[PDB]
């Protein structure tokens, strides 16, 4: 039994734990979310097939690591699925030929949210998975543990929905033009979903997001979002009825608008949250 | 909050 990660790099094998480096591209599914499909990542081969035959099982206590240590999910380990943290050894994984095979292993996670997310950057732990190895010749048995690290920024979906960006910038014209936002959002299966804004308002109708530009602002204007012409107040909940597996467009319009007095030349920032909710 | 929009624009002189 050994292994490598798919651009070639060798995973260390056996004795003391191994840093593994996996890409991954966690979506959500129906009742589960994906975080990492493994078996595009990690290959393992027998050295000795004519005369050996490796056997490998993920063993109890295997878990989630880092900022996903508190969630619960499961494990898709050779076509079946399992609780995950797991809480018994799964069945063998037989590797007994000199070519490459995946290690079949996916991690799902048990949605929490509506459409939440947790970012994971390059180098942050995953997942510490705890192997155990075995043959038909032999007493050898040994366990073993190998820490998943993201090889690449992500957003692990924590809901039944996702969406198009998680950090969205748009540009308006030049005042007072408007410019319409794309974002959308999808369900692994059917959602009834609205959503509401944050943000720092500058008006009586907690509905212009204050211009907060750094460099020579702009006076007397902030941002004001508008679903089909309809002003879009902070912190009042907007219905998207059921979302299904395509994509919803939230519908969103950005528009400078007036906060009192002399409207003054300069740049203009407003960062606003959308936030998801179950209706 | 689930999303972030940064909206930038301009009042020309």
């Known amino acids: ?39 595009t990542q990690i290959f393992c081969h027998n050295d000795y ?18 900022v996903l240590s508190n969630f619960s999910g499961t494990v898709k380990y050779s076509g079946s699925s399992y609780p995950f943290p797991t809480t018994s050894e799964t069945p063998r994984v037989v590797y007994n030929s000199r070519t490459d095979k995946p290690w079949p292993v996916a991690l799902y996670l048990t949605p929490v949210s509506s459409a939440g997310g947790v970012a994971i950057k390059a180098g942050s732990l995953i997942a510490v998975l705890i192997l155990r190895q075995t043959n038909n010749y032999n007493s050898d048995d040994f366990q073993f543990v190998w820490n998943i690290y993201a090889n690449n920024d992500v957003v692990v979906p924590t809901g039944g929905c996702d969406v198009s960006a998680r950090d969205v910038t748009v540009t308006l014209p030049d005042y007072p033009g ?32 204050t211009n907060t530009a750094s460099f020579s602002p702009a006076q007397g204007v902030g941002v004001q979002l508008t679903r089909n012409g309809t002003i879009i107040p902070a912190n009042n909940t907007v219905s998207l009825g059921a979302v299904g597996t395509s994509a ?5 319009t950005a528009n400078y608008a007036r906060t009192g007095g002399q409207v003054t030349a300069g740049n203009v920032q407003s960062i606003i949250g959308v936030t998801f909710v179950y209706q | 909050a689930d999303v972030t929009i940064t909206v930038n624009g301009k009042v020309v002189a």
């Open chain 1, 1 to 39: 039994f050994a292994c490598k990660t798919a651009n070639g790099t060798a995973i260390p094998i056996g004795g003391g734990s191994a840093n593994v480096y996996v890409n991954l591209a966690p979506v959500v599914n129906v009742g589960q979310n994906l975080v990492v499909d493994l078996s």
């Open chain 1, 49 to 66: 097939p004519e005369t050996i035959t490796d056997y490998v099982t993920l063993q109890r206590g295997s878990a989630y690591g880092g």
């Open chain 1, 178 to 209: 408007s410019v319409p936002i794309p974002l959308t959002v999808y369900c692994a299966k059917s959602q009834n979903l609205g959503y509401y804004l944050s943000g720092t308002t500058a008006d009586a109708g907690n509905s212009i997001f």
């Open chain 1, 248 to 252: 919803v467009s939230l519908g969103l």
